[PDB]
Design a protein around this nucleic acid. Structure first.
Ligand code: IVC
Ligand code: IVC
Lengths: 184, 185
DNA sequence: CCTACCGATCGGTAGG
DNA sequence: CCTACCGATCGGTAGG
C-alpha cells in the first residue's frame, strides 16, 4: 500500500531525477491525481526522505546484516564488497541508487538523518580497515582512505555498469575484491 | 572573453543547485545580466550544459592527460594520473569537471553521445596502462576494465564526500589511494 | 481520493 | 484552483 507508492515514485525519481520528476507524473503513474497523492505523503521532500530511508533499510538488510558478524576483518570487507556490488548491479532497489545520486538534494533534519545513517556504514568500514591494518592482514592504510576507496569502487558502479555489457557483475566483484584485498 | 565567464558562473550554480534545479533567471542574475541578455550568448539551457561539459573536458585533458600521457613506465603513469586527477577534484577550482561527474545522465541525444565519447577516451587510456602494467608484471594481474573503473571509482567518488577542512589533506588522500592500488611490487 | 484552482516560476522570445 | 544587451512578456508548468 504505502511502500507500493515509494516503489513507484522511486522508479521515476531515478530515471528523471528528483528536480526533474513532477508530482503530476508521479500521481499519474500511481493512477491518482496530484491532490490524491498528497493524502498519503506530506510533500515532495518527505517523499524523497521516505524513499532514502526505505533504501537504507534494504541496504542494511542485504549487506551489513549479512557481514556484521564476521570475525576476520579482511574476510568481512571481502563479503561486504561482494554484497554491495550486487546490490547496485542487480538493480533490485532503485531507492538505493537515489541515495547515491541525490546525496546533496535533502536539507535540514531530513538531510542530517540519512547522513547519520550513511556515516554508520563509513564507521563500519573505517573500523574494519583499522582492524585488518593492525592485525597485519592488509598493507597499512589510513582507515578513511580505505573506506572511501572501498566505497568509491563499489558505489561508482551505478554510473557505468550495464547488465548486457562485456563482463558480469560476478566477474567485476571477484576482480575488485582481489584488486583491493589480495592475499597478504 | 565574455562567453567563457558565463560558463564558469553558470557552472558554479549548476554545481550547487544542480541542472534541473537551477533557473535561467538566477544564472542571469549571477552573470549580472537580464535573462534576455543571457540568451544572446547561449542558444538555450541544453547547449549551456553541453558547453560547460566540453570546457570541463578541455580542462581535464590539460591538467591530467596532457601531463602524464608521455610517461613510458605504465604503473608510473597510473600513479601520476591518479595524483593529478585526485587534485583536480579536491581543489574544487573547476566546477565544470564536477558537473561532468554528477550530471552524467542529464544530457540526451547527440550532445550526450559527444560528451560520452570524450569520456571513453579516458577509460581506453586507463585500460591500456592497466593492460601494459599487467603484461610487464609491474602490478598484479587484473582485467583492464575492472582496473580502470576501480581507478575511477576511488578518484572520482571524492567529489561526494571530500571537505577541504577535514583531518586529511588532498595530498594525504593521494598518497594513501595510490599506495593502496599501486604499491611497490 | 477528486475538481477546482492559487502564487510563482519555468525556459524562451517579443519589439527597441 | 553590427555587437551586446534591455524591459517586458510569451505560452506552460511547478508544488501545494
Ligand atoms: C573530468 C573527467 C575525469 C570525467 C571523465 O572522463 S570520467 C568518464 C569515465 N568514468 C565514468 O564513471 C563515467 C560514467 N558515465 C559514462 O557515460 C561512461 O563514460 C560510459 C557509460 C562508459 C559511456 O560510454 P559509452 O560507450 O558512450 O556508452 P555504453 O554504455 O554503451 O558503452 C559501454 C562501455 O561501459 C563499460 N561497461 C559498462 N558495462 C560493462 C560491463 N557489464 N562489463 C564491462 N564493461 C562495462 C565499458 O567501458 C563499455 O565499453 P566497451 O566494453 O564497449 O569497450
Ligand atoms: C548503498 C548505500 C546506501 C551505502 C551508503 O550509505 S553511502 C556511504 C557514504 N559515502 C559517500 O560517499 C556518500 C557521499 N558522502 C556523504 O554522504 C557524507 O559525506 C557522509 C560521510 C555520509 C556524511 O558526512 P557528515 O558527517 O554527515 O558531514 P561532513 O560534511 O562533516 O562529513 C565529514 C566526514 O566525511 C569524511 N571526510 C570528509 N572530508 C575529509 C577529509 N578532508 N579527510 C578525512 N575525511 C574526510 C570523513 O568521513 C568525515 O567524518 P569525520 O572525519 O568527521 O569523522
Amino acid at each position: 500500500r504505502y511502500r507500493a507508492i515509494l516503489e513507484t515514485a522511486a522508479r521515476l525519481i531515478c530515471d528523471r531525477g528528483y528536480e526533474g520528476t513532477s508530482m503530476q507524473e508521479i500521481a499519474a503513474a500511481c493512477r491518482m491525481t496530484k491532490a490524491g497523492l498528497y493524502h498519503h505523503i506530506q510533500n515532495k521532500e518527505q517523499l524523497l526522505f521516505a524513499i532514502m530511508n526505505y533504501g537504507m533499510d534494504l541496504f542494511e538488510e542485504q549487506v551489513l546484516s549479512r557481514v556484521q558478524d564476521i570475525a576476520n576483518p579482511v574476510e568481512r570487507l571481502r563479503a561486504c564488497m561482494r554484497h554491495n556490488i550486487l546490490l547496485v548491479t542487480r538493480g533490485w532497489s532503485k531507492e538505493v541508487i537515489i541515495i547515491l545520486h541525490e546525496h546533496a538534494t535533502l536539507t535540514g533534519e531530513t538531510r542530517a538523518f540519512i547522513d547519520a545513517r550513511k556515516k554508520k556504514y563509513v564507521d563500519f568500514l573505517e573500523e574494519a580497515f583499522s582492524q585488518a591494518s593492525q592485525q597485519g592482514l592488509i598493507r597499512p592504510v589510513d582507515p578513511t582512505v580505505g573506506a572511501f576507496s572501498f566505497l568509491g569502487m563499489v558505489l561508482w558502479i551505478y554510473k557505468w555498469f550495464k547488465p548486457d555489457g562485456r563482463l558480469t557483475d560476478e566477474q567485476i566483484a571477484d576482480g575488485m575484491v582481489g584488486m583491493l584485498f589480495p592475499p597478504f
